[PDB]
Amino acid sequence: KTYTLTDYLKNTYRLKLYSLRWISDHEYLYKNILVFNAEYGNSSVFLENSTFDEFGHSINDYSISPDGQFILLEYNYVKQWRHSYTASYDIYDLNKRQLITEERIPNNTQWVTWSPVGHKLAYVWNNDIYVKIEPNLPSYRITWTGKEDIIYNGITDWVYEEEVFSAYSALWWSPNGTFLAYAQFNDTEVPLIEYSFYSDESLQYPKTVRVPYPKAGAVNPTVKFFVVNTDSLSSVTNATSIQITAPASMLIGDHYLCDVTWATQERISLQWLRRIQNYSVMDICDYDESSGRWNCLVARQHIEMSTTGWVGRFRPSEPHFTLDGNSFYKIISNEEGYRHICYFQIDKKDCTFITKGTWEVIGIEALTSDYLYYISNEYKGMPGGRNLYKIQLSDYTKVTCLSCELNPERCQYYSVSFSKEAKYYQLRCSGPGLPLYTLHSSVNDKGLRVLEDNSALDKMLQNVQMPSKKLDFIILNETKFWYQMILPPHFDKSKKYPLLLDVYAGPCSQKADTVFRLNWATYLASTENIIVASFDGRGSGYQGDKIMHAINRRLGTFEVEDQIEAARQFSKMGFVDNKRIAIWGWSYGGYVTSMVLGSGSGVFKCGIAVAPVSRWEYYDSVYTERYMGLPTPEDNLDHYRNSTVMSRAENFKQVEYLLIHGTADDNVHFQQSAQISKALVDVGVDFQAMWYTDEDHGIASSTAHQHIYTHMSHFIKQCFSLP
Amino acid sequence: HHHSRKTYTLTDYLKNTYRLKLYSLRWISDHEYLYKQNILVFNAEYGNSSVFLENSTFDEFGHSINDYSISPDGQFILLEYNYVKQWRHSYTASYDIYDLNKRQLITEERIPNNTQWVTWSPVGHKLAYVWNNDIYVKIEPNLPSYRITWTGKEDIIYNGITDWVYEEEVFSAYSALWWSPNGTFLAYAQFNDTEVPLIEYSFYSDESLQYPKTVRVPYPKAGAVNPTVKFFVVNTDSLSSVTNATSIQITAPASMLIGDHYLCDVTWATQERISLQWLRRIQNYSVMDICDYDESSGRWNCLVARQHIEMSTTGWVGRFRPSEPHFTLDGNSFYKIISNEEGYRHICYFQIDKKDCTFITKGTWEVIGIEALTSDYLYYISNEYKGMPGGRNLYKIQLSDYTKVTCLSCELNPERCQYYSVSFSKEAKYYQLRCSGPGLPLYTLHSSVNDKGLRVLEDNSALDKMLQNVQMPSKKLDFIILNETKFWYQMILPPHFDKSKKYPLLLDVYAGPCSQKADTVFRLNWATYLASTENIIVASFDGRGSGYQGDKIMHAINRRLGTFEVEDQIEAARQFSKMGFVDNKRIAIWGWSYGGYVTSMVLGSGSGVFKCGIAVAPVSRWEYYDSVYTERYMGLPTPEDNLDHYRNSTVMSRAENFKQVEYLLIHGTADDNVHFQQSAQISKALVDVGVDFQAMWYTDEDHGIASSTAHQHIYTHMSHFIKQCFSLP
Numbered sequence A: 001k002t003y004t005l006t007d008y009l010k011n012t013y014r015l016k017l018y019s020l021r022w023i024s025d026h027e028y029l030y031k032n033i034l035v036f037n038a039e040y041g042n043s044s045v046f047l048e049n050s051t052f053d054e055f056g057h058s059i060n061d062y063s064i065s066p067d068g069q070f071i072l073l074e075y076n077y078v079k080q081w082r083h084s085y086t087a088s089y090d091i092y093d094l095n096k097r098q099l100i101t102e103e104r105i106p107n108n109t110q111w112v113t114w115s116p117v118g119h120k121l122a123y124v125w126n127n128d129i130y131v132k133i134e135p136n137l138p139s140y141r142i143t144w145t146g147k148e149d150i151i152y153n154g155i156t157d158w159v160y161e162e163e164v165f166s167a168y169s170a171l172w173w174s175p176n177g178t179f180l181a182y183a184q185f186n187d188t189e190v191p192l193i194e195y196s197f198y199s200d201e202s203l204q205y206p207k208t209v210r211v212p213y214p215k216a217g218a219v220n221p222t223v224k225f226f227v228v229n230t231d232s233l234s235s236v237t238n239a240t241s242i243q244i245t246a247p248a249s250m251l252i253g254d255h256y257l258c259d260v261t262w263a264t265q266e267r268i269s270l271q272w273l274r275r276i277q278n279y280s281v282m283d284i285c286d287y288d289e290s291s292g293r294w295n296c297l298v299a300r301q302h303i304e305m306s307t308t309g310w311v312g313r314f315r316p317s318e319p320h321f322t323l324d325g326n327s328f329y330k331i332i333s334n335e336e337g338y339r340h341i342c343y344f345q346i347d348k349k350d351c352t353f354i355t356k357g358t359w360e361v362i363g364i365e366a367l368t369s370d371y372l373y374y375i376s377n378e379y380k381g382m383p384g385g386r387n388l389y390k391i392q393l394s395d396y397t398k399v400t401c402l403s404c405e406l407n408p409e410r411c412q413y414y415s416v417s418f419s420k421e422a423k424y425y426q427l428r429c430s431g432p433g434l435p436l437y438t439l440h441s442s443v444n445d446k447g448l449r450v451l452e453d454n455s456a457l458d459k460m461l462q463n464v465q466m467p468s469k470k471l472d473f474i475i476l477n478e479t480k481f482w483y484q485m486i487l488p489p490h491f492d493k494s495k496k497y498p499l500l501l502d503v504y505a506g507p508c509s510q511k512a513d514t515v516f517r518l519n520w521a522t523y524l525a526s527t528e529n530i531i532v533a534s535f536d537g538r539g540s541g542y543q544g545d546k547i548m549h550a551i552n553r554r555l556g557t558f559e560v561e562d563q564i565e566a567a568r569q570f571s572k573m574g575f576v577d578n579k580r581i582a583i584w585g586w587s588y589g590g591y592v593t594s595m596v597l598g599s600g601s602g603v604f605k606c607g608i609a610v611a612p613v614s615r616w617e618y619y620d621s622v623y624t625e626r627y628m629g630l631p632t633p634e635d636n637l638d639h640y641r642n643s644t645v646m647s648r649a650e651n652f653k654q655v656e657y658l659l660i661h662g663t664a665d666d667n668v669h670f671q672q673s674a675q676i677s678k679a680l681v682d683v684g685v686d687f688q689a690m691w692y693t694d695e696d697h698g699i700a701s702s703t704a705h706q707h708i709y710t711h712m713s714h715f716i717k718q719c720f721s722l723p
Numbered sequence B: 001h002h003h004s005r006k007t008y009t010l011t012d013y014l015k016n017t018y019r020l021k022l023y024s025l026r027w028i029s030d031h032e033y034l035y036k037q038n039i040l041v042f043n044a045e046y047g048n049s050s051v052f053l054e055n056s057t058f059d060e061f062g063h064s065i066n067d068y069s070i071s072p073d074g075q076f077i078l079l080e081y082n083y084v085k086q087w088r089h090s091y092t093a094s095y096d097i098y099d100l101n102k103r104q105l106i107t108e109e110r111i112p113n114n115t116q117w118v119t120w121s122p123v124g125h126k127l128a129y130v131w132n133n134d135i136y137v138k139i140e141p142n143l144p145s146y147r148i149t150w151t152g153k154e155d156i157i158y159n160g161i162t163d164w165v166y167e168e169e170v171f172s173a174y175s176a177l178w179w180s181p182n183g184t185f186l187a188y189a190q191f192n193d194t195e196v197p198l199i200e201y202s203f204y205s206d207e208s209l210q211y212p213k214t215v216r217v218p219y220p221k222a223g224a225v226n227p228t229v230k231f232f233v234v235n236t237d238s239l240s241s242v243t244n245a246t247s248i249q250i251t252a253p254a255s256m257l258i259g260d261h262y263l264c265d266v267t268w269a270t271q272e273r274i275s276l277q278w279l280r281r282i283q284n285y286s287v288m289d290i291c292d293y294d295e296s297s298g299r300w301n302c303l304v305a306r307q308h309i310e311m312s313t314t315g316w317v318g319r320f321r322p323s324e325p326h327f328t329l330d331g332n333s334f335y336k337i338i339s340n341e342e343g344y345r346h347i348c349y350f351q352i353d354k355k356d357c358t359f360i361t362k363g364t365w366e367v368i369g370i371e372a373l374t375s376d377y378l379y380y381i382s383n384e385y386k387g388m389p390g391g392r393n394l395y396k397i398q399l400s401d402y403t404k405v406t407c408l409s410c411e412l413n414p415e416r417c418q419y420y421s422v423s424f425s426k427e428a429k430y431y432q433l434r435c436s437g438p439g440l441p442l443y444t445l446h447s448s449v450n451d452k453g454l455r456v457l458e459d460n461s462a463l464d465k466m467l468q469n470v471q472m473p474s475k476k477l478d479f480i481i482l483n484e485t486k487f488w489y490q491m492i493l494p495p496h497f498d499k500s501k502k503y504p505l506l507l508d509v510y511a512g513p514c515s516q517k518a519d520t521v522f523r524l525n526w527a528t529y530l531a532s533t534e535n536i537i538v539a540s541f542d543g544r545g546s547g548y549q550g551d552k553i554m555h556a557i558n559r560r561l562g563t564f565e566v567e568d569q570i571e572a573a574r575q576f577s578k579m580g581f582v583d584n585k586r587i588a589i590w591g592w593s594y595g596g597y598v599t600s601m602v603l604g605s606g607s608g609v610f611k612c613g614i615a616v617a618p619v620s621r622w623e624y625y626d627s628v629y630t631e632r633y634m635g636l637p638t639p640e641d642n643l644d645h646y647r648n649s650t651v652m653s654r655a656e657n658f659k660q661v662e663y664l665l666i667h668g669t670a671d672d673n674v675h676f677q678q679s680a681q682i683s684k685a686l687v688d689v690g691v692d693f694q695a696m697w698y699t700d701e702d703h704g705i706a707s708s709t710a711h712q713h714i715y716t717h718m719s720h721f722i723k724q725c726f727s728l729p
């Protein structure tokens, strides 16, 4: 038997996880909720969820204070954007098992967070910030200026949530929780995207949703940064919020706050980025004693820039400070364009690189007094592998691979999670074999035990004909470009398979990796006998700037051409039926799919774009201007005009096209597909469409998810003459 | 050979390869009319024509001329340009006036840009126009205009123009101005939309528009706050440039001010007598008021003794609204279409003073419209001929002897002509006859004194010459007995039609209250292609709820939309198969508007009869559609009226049954009439029960999906869908 559409849709074959929250340097929680001792693996029950038997409300999430004296309960969850939401809250006392009733956290709270030490609490209600020193006492109102859709204290607006921070919160406690650092966003002049929301059938008149949303070249939100001392809050007088202004080099024009990182109890570092995102500045600000302000000396500014592109992968990387805070490490691209760990002195311009080579550091995971722990794709020169390394701080040549040889056949893609002081770590392996979860001791790196091996799943999959994955590379202009293929079971090299190109191809993307996945591709390969391939061409990430910056100021050119060239290279692989080649993608993949189908190349018979960008002036400023610069006569308007899918409408006469878009998509506005269809209508091209009423960019509803995949499978089977 | 080998193709339909010529004129006097080439005057009597306006005169103009309007006294011409469409009838435009006798454009005191409506008085050259929701009057074209109203406010106050609902469902027109017969008085309506909710939808516009626009229209959905209405009359002879003009209000009768009502008809009776018709929001009760000007007062009075009640116990009043009266010259009597004691619409003769009228026509047929009345004769269109409800002929009844009825069109050309409409001269001395089928449209001119034909205007013989070689479909018009009642249907049958083989069949559906899809009209449309090229029988059926056959049939779906008319379409299909020449594995259904609603209701009915269907811009649930139309048939969506059936008749609740059929759902995003919402809500329901289906939106298209490129695209898309559902290569 085979892995079927139903299997994928009704999630028949499950991937077991082992998610843990470190609580201390030797303990973690595991949802009843258990507490585990990392040393021995023994566990006691923390609370039965029959403790809230009579609670009366459906509990969404829990959150334990650092000191473990109180638990925060979250209910009435109402999802907003990708990260943002609203909820009700309650505080349960562990010391004396019962809830708090006096001075509760209001309904419709936008964000809550314990300080990093003890049980202090900061929350956001109606765009304003409040602080509770004790869970049962009244809160002090920090900000008074919050206003819906206009002023944002402690939480991000639409574009910051999605493109800058990947988070709704804009609150940063200092390490011991004395200081609360926050940002304030101002959206007064940011234009609003409006779209219909149809809601339940019983709603007679549709609702109009309005969201401040800066499209490429529009007026952006403005940002201010503040620090407040939470150990001197008066119930008599208003809390005083000290402002930290952006450096002079940023106040000269539009700019972003892109990073907040505390260094010590009294030292904070902020990163700022120009609107033309190729110049950024790191401020280190120290707290002044009697005077009570924050100073950011000019001689302590650290400039990060790029002549060939934008700075960072999506944003400048984050610093990891030493204990005294007089030094830090952060990832930057070296002189040959590869991203490696640089070591800075707070007082000095030059850093020394502590890693080198033709491969990249993915991130810094933990920093100790003796070692620095990082993840990279160095192992076997494979851009799509991921391994944990240890680097000796007094001798940089002493680098140990901690995950490389643990199970080299089944494990090539690792992420990690260290305990409070990096005493223990959990390795998470995501492929090529079934995911593997292991617990380790950093004092010597020996493995304590397996936490989850997925043997349950492995026994079930023994019964089904499963596809395989080929990960390899092709040479193009003397450079390696990586591809992967999901191959049908009992794959015959002397046979001719229909091929479907799964595309993303956005700047810094990586679609060829060692990760094990059960998705739509799995079914297409297992049941329909279709080869599903992906390709990382120019603009793709984790392989140096030369490749990544190749599309600087030129979205919709080389990365499009490379998908076409990829499909050509596969035709010449012998086992591909080149009368049956298709391409599909979501978001950026949708844009590339569309551009490829509009290319008039002749290679693809049909394709599917889901929620595609259609022209760049339609998408948000932060993401778009990062790669395209500004849509103005003196910058890059010409290429904004030359890279629309609309302009390629005539070429669509050559292919079969299915266009799909959610009508309540706040991210890629329905507008984008509305303009594509009008364009195809105007040149007389027949095509397939489908809208999803009240679905957003995810088309994530249980039923909408099934509908779309079902619809797409029918399109593909019809296009490929499959019954 | 020389055998017919061409067929009527999709491209033929989309590119207008075979075009119907039509002779459109506009009478300017009692014996003269205007016709376009260039613009000619034609003497109706002789045929002699001189050039009235050479095409070259307005090229110095600088602007592209969309339309023209000659003043009643032929001294001035109104030139319309910068036309920008709004709804089905309303638009904005610029206007310039060309003086004929001085032979040049009036430069001083021009009509402002963005004018909403312009209208000459019926005699002379007075002018009335609406700009920014206010009414202005020009006594002379080159002179300053006097402002009549001062209260006009966009989306709130409408003076002399209708709002969305009154435009689409009450008046079928943007204007709400009425000149008295000689231009002395100017009657107008004011609409107040203050508390009317707004429908909001996205307009995406040109691709250079970065942020979509949101369009906001005052639109009362069933049960919502309706617009209120006031009525006024202003004497245009006593206007002065020194004082603001005085407008005399005429208030509705007591029985209307008691609750929500509508102004449904305005008809001047003489120089000093106007008739009003009002309707209650529950549209079964209407009151005609006859109002007279009082000389010494300057005010209007509607005597309660002249008041006329018209009501219905089995449904609503009139076909879509009460009928309009036709007054005798002395405005002391009138003729008006109403239903007789047994549900048949016939001409009633009324005295202004008496309650009772006498019916001057009788029969198991109906009068369609009164077309003209003179001293001795009344002219009307009816479907009496041969007891064919879908036929239309011009008749003549003698006012002093009701048994003296002459058919004027019946026998003219019985074989090709069975569907007529007429256009009379200014005093009914001549008339143009228009025949729409079953043969090729034919256009003829007649004098009504002797009734002789004067000449053929257009005979479509160029078209006839082209069709001679094309394998054209034929139409079969007939009926079936159900519950002892005749129910008519029409079939567009493929060329060389063979009773002994099985054809696939498409049900073409409207089926709304008072609809008629079975008729004698000749059409070159999508169905002609499907029969001719693709060999599909496309059929239509008038079931319960359809019109022009009496109230017994028409009112059968009263307060029960989505029941019998839906059921009768299913039964129609079972009947069609039972005739033996239908492949019942291949039966489909499609419709637009109400037809889309019925299509959907049918496909969700679980009947097992239809394999697939197409719904275009359908109504999905009645609480989404407008008040005037929906309440006419459904009453109010309240617990103490008819909420139950409103809830019982949505397409959404039938989603589960769509698992059995193939469904194509189509909707323009800028549809102001049946909002995108209605399709949006169907699709969501189908997704929720796991039904796959085909969808297509049209960016910025409205209810008509009538852009050239958009029209071509949807018919092509629909054609692919049907061809695949039927296994046609």
Ligand SMILES: *[C@@H]1O[C@H](CO)[C@@H](O[C@@H]2O[C@H](CO)[C@@H](O)[C@H](O)[C@H]2NC(C)=O)[C@H](O)[C@H]1NC(C)=O
Residues within 6 Å of the ligand: A145, A151, A186, A187, A188, A189
């Ligand atoms: C957010 O920014 C807006 C727009 O820059 C500020 O609005 C201005 O406020 C000043 C002083 O109050 C006025 O003189 C201007 O006329 C305002 N401009 C506009 C267009 O509104 C606003 O002050 C800022 N709000 C906060 C809390 O920082």
Ligand SMILES: *[C@@H]1O[C@H](CO)[C@@H](O[C@@H]2O[C@H](CO)[C@@H](O)[C@H](O)[C@H]2NC(C)=O)[C@H](O)[C@H]1NC(C)=O
Residues within 6 Å of the ligand: A144, A237, A238
């Ligand atoms: C703390 O600050 C807030 C805002 O500055 C004060 O609340 C405002 O009080 C002023 C008068 O001082 C009023 O004009 C506003 O209407 C108030 N705005 C509100 C309700 O947010 C608050 O009173 C301050 N506390 C004190 C007394 O210093």
Ligand SMILES: *[C@@H]1O[C@H](CO)[C@@H](O[C@@H]2O[C@H](CO)[C@@H](O)[C@H](O)[C@H]2NC(C)=O)[C@H](O)[C@H]1NC(C)=O
Residues within 6 Å of the ligand: B151, B157, B192, B193, B194, B195
């Ligand atoms: C249109 O109708 C609105 C509301 O139906 C009228 O508004 C009323 O006006 C008076 C004063 O002019 C207020 O005191 C009432 O309270 C208003 N009614 C309500 C309940 O809103 C308005 O007069 C009308 N507009 C015109 C000029 O005809």
Ligand SMILES: Cn1c(=O)c2c(nc(N3CCNCC3)n2Cc2ccccc2Cl)n(C)c1=O
Residues within 6 Å of the ligand: A162, A163, A504, A506, A586, A587, A588, A589, A613, A623, A667, A668, A697
């Ligand atoms: C496929 N894909 C992406 O395209 C992608 C993507 N991430 C991004 N960007 C970073 C997160 N915020 C949005 C941009 N993109 C591009 C994108 C996402 C959603 C809508 C439009 C765009 Cl252009 N991923 C993970 C991803 O998997």
Ligand SMILES: Cn1c(=O)c2c(nc(N3CCNCC3)n2Cc2ccccc2Cl)n(C)c1=O
Residues within 6 Å of the ligand: B168, B169, B320, B510, B512, B592, B593, B594, B595, B619, B625, B629, B673, B674, B703
């Ligand atoms: C097919 N068809 C109609 O459906 C029709 C229709 N006429 C109507 N109504 C009367 C005129 N004004 C609109 C309503 N309908 C029903 C309808 C039309 C347009 C949108 C929605 C509806 Cl429910 N015609 C002529 C007509 O030909």
Ligand SMILES: *[C@@H]1O[C@H](CO)[C@@H](O)[C@H](O)[C@H]1NC(C)=O
Residues within 6 Å of the ligand: A035, A036, A037, A040, A042, A043, A044
């Ligand atoms: C595990 O065992 C140790 C000693 O046996 C004990 O101190 C600890 O509390 C236990 N941990 C849990 C969470 O059960």
Ligand SMILES: *[C@@H]1O[C@H](CO)[C@@H](O)[C@H](O)[C@H]1NC(C)=O
Residues within 6 Å of the ligand: A088, A104, A105, A106, A107
């Ligand atoms: C939140 O809302 C509920 C229901 O409306 C109310 O009963 C409850 O007291 C609210 N919680 C608080 C603490 O405001």
Ligand SMILES: *[C@@H]1O[C@H](CO)[C@@H](O)[C@H](O)[C@H]1NC(C)=O
Residues within 6 Å of the ligand: A176, A177, A178, A231, A265, A266
């Ligand atoms: C944390 O650090 C602050 C600032 O240096 C210091 O004064 C204090 O000892 C700590 N806060 C508390 C009260 O725990």
Ligand SMILES: *[C@@H]1O[C@H](CO)[C@@H](O)[C@H](O)[C@H]1NC(C)=O
Residues within 6 Å of the ligand: A276, A278, A279, A305, A306, A307, A308, A629
């Ligand atoms: C940033 O980009 C702009 C626009 O391409 C360019 O003029 C400038 O040189 C860049 N700055 C740096 C530091 O390279």
Ligand SMILES: *[C@@H]1O[C@H](CO)[C@@H](O)[C@H](O)[C@H]1NC(C)=O
Residues within 6 Å of the ligand: B043, B046, B048, B049, B050
């Ligand atoms: C039309 O023809 C008639 C008949 O000969 C002629 O008298 C007349 O002058 C023509 N039309 C006009 C009024 O110019």
Ligand SMILES: *[C@@H]1O[C@H](CO)[C@@H](O)[C@H](O)[C@H]1NC(C)=O
Residues within 6 Å of the ligand: B094, B110, B111, B112, B113
């Ligand atoms: C209408 O607009 C045009 C173009 O802007 C202008 O030249 C003209 O004067 C306007 N006409 C009137 C009557 O105001």
Ligand SMILES: *[C@@H]1O[C@H](CO)[C@@H](O)[C@H](O)[C@H]1NC(C)=O
Residues within 6 Å of the ligand: B150, B242, B243, B244
């Ligand atoms: C006419 O009415 C308007 C608005 O009520 C007013 O402003 C204007 O002055 C009036 N004209 C005169 C002078 O009577």
Ligand SMILES: *[C@@H]1O[C@H](CO)[C@@H](O)[C@H](O)[C@H]1NC(C)=O
Residues within 6 Å of the ligand: B182, B184, B271, B272
């Ligand atoms: C039009 O009718 C009115 C009222 O009957 C009358 O007083 C007026 O003089 C008429 N106009 C002409 C000159 O025909």
